[PDB]
Design a protein around this ligand. Structure first.
Ligand SMILES: *[C@@H]1O[C@H](CO)[C@@H](O[C@@H]2O[C@H](CO)[C@@H](O)[C@H](O)[C@H]2NC(C)=O)[C@H](O)[C@H]1NC(C)=O
Ligand SMILES: *[C@@H]1O[C@H](CO)[C@@H](O[C@@H]2O[C@H](CO)[C@@H](O)[C@H](O)[C@H]2NC(C)=O)[C@H](O)[C@H]1NC(C)=O
Ligand SMILES: *[C@@H]1O[C@H](CO)[C@@H](O[C@@H]2O[C@H](CO)[C@@H](O)[C@H](O)[C@H]2NC(C)=O)[C@H](O)[C@H]1NC(C)=O
Ligand SMILES: *[C@@H]1O[C@H](CO)[C@@H](O[C@@H]2O[C@H](CO)[C@@H](O)[C@H](O)[C@H]2NC(C)=O)[C@H](O)[C@H]1NC(C)=O
Ligand SMILES: *[C@@H]1O[C@H](CO)[C@@H](O[C@@H]2O[C@H](CO)[C@@H](O)[C@H](O)[C@H]2NC(C)=O)[C@H](O)[C@H]1NC(C)=O
Ligand SMILES: *[C@@H]1O[C@H](CO)[C@@H](O)[C@H](O)[C@H]1NC(C)=O
Ligand SMILES: *[C@@H]1O[C@H](CO)[C@@H](O)[C@H](O)[C@H]1NC(C)=O
Ligand SMILES: *[C@@H]1O[C@H](CO)[C@@H](O)[C@H](O)[C@H]1NC(C)=O
Ligand SMILES: *[C@@H]1O[C@H](CO)[C@@H](O)[C@H](O)[C@H]1NC(C)=O
Ligand SMILES: *[C@@H]1O[C@H](CO)[C@@H](O)[C@H](O)[C@H]1NC(C)=O
Ligand SMILES: *[C@@H]1O[C@H](CO)[C@@H](O)[C@H](O)[C@H]1NC(C)=O
Lengths: 347, 49, 298, 50, 50
């Protein structure tokens, strides 16, 4: 019995199509020069092979000490939502983002993430998290996206072109439809100009459609800008109410406090180790650092822009990061025809 | 020590090589010294002399 | 109640020069021993800033409504805590939403509401002769505030409020930006010893706060404080002295700067890459030193 | 030293740091960004050798 | 925008142009095609569909 590993092999096909020989390209430096020259024969000389490489032994995770669960219950299960023109914004901090607790009670017709893959959410830590809430008509949900037009995206709620975060929407006919007609929810219909991203306009001034000023009287060509949705249990699906939550956050630049579900390990130093710091992953050797960070910074970067220092989120100490592959190697051969014996030079 | 003439000794002190010697060990630049010294910054990215 | 201050001599506006002022940290990444280029909204070097006084001697209690073009550099030379805050908005008349940032004797208050601001907002400090003490009596800023979306009140403190006699002892620098619904504030405090004119030197401002207000700011107005005593005889609109203070306003533009980080991570120097052709060659060579010769610029 | 400095170019990708891309993105979406970086860095090496 | 106060569209998709530039453009050889289909079949009104 033997066990397989991922390797690169150089296979040889004769003129009948059968594999008659092979070279394991990572057995020896000699095999590496065979693999590079793409031949089974090496002439006498000295060859550069590859820099000396060290593989990591351990894996470590360092997330901040967070105990509470995030408020999924007064965000996704609120009794009353806001109107889209006066939309709501809520700060979120100091909580674990374990969203599988939503599985057994909530079903979302829309869930789309920008700037991040949904399969990485469990391994990340989130900066400056906000939640926006409102209610719209079913037809208008496609407008909650970057670079959209329409009355919601022009007068009511605008997303940035460069947006990081998720948009979540679900049907709420049972909660927000009344047999007579539910007129609590409003939207803006007339506006001089389009809104800027993440801007809220709550004024109620008579809109002047043409000339002949209104003096706030609401006459001919002088309108009341806000209008009401009529939500009734027997509407088509296009006209039914939908509850919408927009989550906005930042990744891997500043200190974070949300930090999804993942168990932390011990901090091990002076060994090449795979590491995860607040969602930022890498490989290397950790050492004690003399750098002093100002309180508002979390990572340090060098000239090549790669991260070389990090504040530990538990002990608040600065650590240096070093690559663990360094140093040149050469191989001396008298010719494969003559012998298989080789010498190796470590520069 | 070097069996050099007087003029050769004068000439050799007027050109300053970027690095003297070709053995810079891994333990020599670990932590702060890397990314500050330019030779180690080169050697951590595969560039050797 | 709102009172229109009288007995204030009108003077032509004054201008001065900013000597490499108004640099702040662009992001939150630690860097050391490096020259770094960044393109952002900065106050250009050697610009032309406006200068405003609060000098009794003339009275000259300056508080105009000013534009807020793309962000503001605000500098303040003080010794007695006269400058107390700001109001930012578009119309400032309860038809739209406005932002109030005020420092009352005890708290720091940040509110976003529909304010009916006074035509001449101010704060009032009164001085009693029988027992030497300065205490805050008046808060005359707005008539009504109705629909409030964002509110913040800081922890209680006691401020000094005593009138001083020496020269200016404190420089306070702020930078205000409004981008994608966030109102961003950077600041720094410095000890000085001077009488007039914004001083020389370099000091980078650090991030202070980032408020999610979501409003359309176009104009702003400074909130100052008053002194009243037994030597200030009159009614509300005439019985008031001033107390010396000065402030400077400049406007930010999109520029490319070359910032310098020492081995401790602080910004100690900068080059404005679009001031001069010399500065452009400095920016291209990525150094602060240029050797003798002829260079193609652009 | 110019070769060392050219490692901070995005070449039209989200970032110039591989570790930043590998977190926050899954393999099928990380591949296109990595491909941009690979093309740019091969071009830099080629210019040096010429 | 005169359509805002009377019409609601479940589908609206533009090819070769961004919807935010429509207000600043002038259009050549404009035609309108009209028909009625079943709801399931709307996804087929797109380039390269079967
Ligand atoms: C932000 O507010 C400003 C000022 O109220 C708006 O700019 C004005 O727009 C009107 C037309 O809508 C013009 O008649 C004025 O001359 C403009 N004044 C200035 C100083 O620009 C601006 O449109 C508002 N922005 C948004 C997105 O609503
Ligand atoms: C201070 O002076 C202003 C004028 O600049 C007064 O505001 C005026 O008030 C009258 C009556 O309410 C209005 O008809 C005017 O339109 C107002 N003018 C402006 C420019 O708003 C204000 O009432 C005075 N404050 C007092 C007397 O306490
Ligand atoms: C700073 O800006 C002010 C305002 O533009 C300049 O003042 C003008 O100067 C010109 C030429 O001296 C005069 O013709 C104008 O009448 C001035 N305007 C005002 C409102 O006074 C000023 O020159 C600029 N530079 C300096 C150094 O002050
Ligand atoms: C400065 O402003 C704060 C907040 O507006 C004031 O504190 C409030 O005072 C009222 C009146 O007693 C209380 O009902 C509130 O509960 C206080 N809010 C707090 C403490 O958060 C404070 O009194 C003001 N200071 C002065 C000198 O006027
Ligand atoms: C802004 O303030 C106005 C004035 O109070 C609000 O309009 C009134 O709100 C009350 C509260 O329910 C209603 O009873 C009235 O019918 C409303 N209209 C009038 C003419 O008084 C308005 O709701 C506020 N807007 C926001 C977004 O909070
Ligand atoms: C290839 O096929 C031929 C024809 O069947 C055979 O004679 C020969 O032995 C095979 N092997 C090699 C290596 O040519
Ligand atoms: C939402 O709140 C209702 C109110 O009682 C509750 O019955 C329901 O279980 C809640 N759903 C959750 C917490 O997922
Ligand atoms: C977090 O946990 C570590 C170890 O359990 C402890 O030293 C630290 O004080 C805790 N709190 C913070 C804020 O790091
Ligand atoms: C004396 O000082 C106290 C507190 O500073 C003040 O409340 C009081 O009014 C002062 N005396 C008089 C007569 O005003
Ligand atoms: C940097 O930090 C050291 C240690 O605190 C200090 O002595 C030095 O003055 C600081 N500034 C510079 C420019 O080195
Ligand atoms: C469409 O035509 C009907 C026919 O009377 C009319 O009632 C309705 O208002 C029209 N809708 C428009 C013009 O948007």
């Amino acid at each position: 019995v033997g066990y397989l590993q991922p390797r690169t092999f150089l296979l040889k096909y004769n003129e009948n199509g059968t594999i008659t020989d092979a070279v394991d390209c990572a057995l020896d430096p000699l095999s590496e020069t065979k693999c590079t020259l793409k031949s089974f024969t090496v002439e006498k000389g000295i060859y550069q092979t590859s820099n000396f490489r060290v593989q990591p032994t351990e894996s470590i995770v360092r997330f901040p000490n967070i105990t509470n669960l995030c408020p999924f219950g007064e965000v996704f299960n609120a009794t009353r939502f806001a109107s889209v023109y006066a939309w709501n914004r809520k700060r979120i901090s100091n909580c674990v983002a374990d969203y599988s607790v939503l599985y057994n009670s909530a079903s979302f017709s829309t869930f789309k993430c920008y700037g991040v893959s949904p399969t990485k959410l469990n391994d990340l830590c989130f900066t400056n998290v906000y939640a926006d809430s409102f209610v719209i008509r079913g037809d208008e949900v496609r407008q909650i996206a970057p670079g959209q037009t329409g009355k919601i995206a022009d007068y009511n709620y605008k997303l940035p072109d460069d947006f990081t975060g998720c948009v979540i929407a679900w049907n709420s006919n049972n909660l927000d439809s009344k047999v007579g007609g539910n007129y609590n929810y409003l939207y803006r219909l007339f506006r001089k100009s389009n809104l800027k991203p993440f801007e809220r306009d709550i004024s109620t001034e008579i809109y002047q459609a043409g000339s002949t000023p209104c003096n706030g009287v609401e006459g001919f060509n002088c309108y009341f800008p806000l209008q009401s949705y009529g939500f009734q249990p027997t509407n088509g699906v296009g006209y039914q109410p939908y509850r919408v939550v927009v989550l906005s956050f930042e990744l891997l630049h500043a200190p974070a406090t949300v930090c999804g579900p993942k168990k932390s390990t011990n901090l091990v130093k002076n060994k090449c180790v795979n590491f995860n710091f607040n969602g930022l992953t890498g490989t290397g050797v950790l050492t004690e650092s003399n750098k002093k960070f100002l309180p508002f910074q979390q990572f340090g970067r060098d000239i090549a822009d790669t991260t070389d220092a990090v504040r530990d989120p538990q002990t608040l100490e600065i650590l240096d990061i070093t690559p663990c592959s360094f140093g040149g190697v050469s191989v001396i051969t008298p010719g494969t025809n003559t012998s298989n014996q080789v010498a190796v030079l470590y520069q | 020590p070097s069996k050099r003439s007087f003029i050769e000794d004068l000439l050799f002190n007027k050109v300053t090589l970027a690095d003297a010697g070709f053995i810079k060990q891994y333990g020599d630049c670990l932590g702060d010294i890397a990314a500050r010294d330019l030779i180690c910054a080169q050697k951590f990215n595969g560039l050797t002399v | 109640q709102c009172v229109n201050l009288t007995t204030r001599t009108q003077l032509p506006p004054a201008y001065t020069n900013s000597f490499t002022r108004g640099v702040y940290y662009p992001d939150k990444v630690f860097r050391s021993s490096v020259l770094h280029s960044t393109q952002d909204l900065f106050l250009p070097f050697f610009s032309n800033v406006t200068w405003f006084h609060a000098i009794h001697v003339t009275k000259r209690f300056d508080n105009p409504v000013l534009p807020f073009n793309d962000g503001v550099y605000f500098a303040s030379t003080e010794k007695s805590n006269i400058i107390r805050g700001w109001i930012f908005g578009t119309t400032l008349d309860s038809k739209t939403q406005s932002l109030l940032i005020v420092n009352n004797a005890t708290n720091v208050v940040i509110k976003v509401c529909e304010f009916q601001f006074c035509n001449d907002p101010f704060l009032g400090v009164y001085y009693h002769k029988n027992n030497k003490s300065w205490m805050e009596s008046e808060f005359r800023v707005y008539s009504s505030a109705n629909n409030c979306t964002f509110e913040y009140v800081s922890q209680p403190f006691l401020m000094d409020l005593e009138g001083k006699q020496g020269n200016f002892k404190n420089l306070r620098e702020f930078v205000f930006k409004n981008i994608d619904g966030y109102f961003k504030i950077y600041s720094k405090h410095t000890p000085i010893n001077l009488v007039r004119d914004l001083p020389q030197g370099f000091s980078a401002l650090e991030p202070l706060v980032d408020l999610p207000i979501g409003i359309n700011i176009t104009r702003f107005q400074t909130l100052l404080a008053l002194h009243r005593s037994y030597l200030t005889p009159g009614d509300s609109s005439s019985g008031w002295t001033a107390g010396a203070a000065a402030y400077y306003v400049g406007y930010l533009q999109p520029r490319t700067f070359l910032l310098k980080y020492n081995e401790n991570g602080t910004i100690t120097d900068a080059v404005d890459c679009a001031l001069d052709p010399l500065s452009e060659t400095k920016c291209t060579l990525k150094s602060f030193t240029v050797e003798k010769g002829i260079y193609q610029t652009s | 030293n110019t070769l060392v400095k050219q490692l901070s170019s995005n070449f039209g990708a989200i970032s110039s740091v591989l570790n930043d891309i590998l977190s926050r993105l899954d393999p099928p979406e990380a591949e296109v960004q990595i491909d941009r970086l690979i093309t740019g860095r091969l071009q830099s090496l080629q210019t040096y050798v010429t």
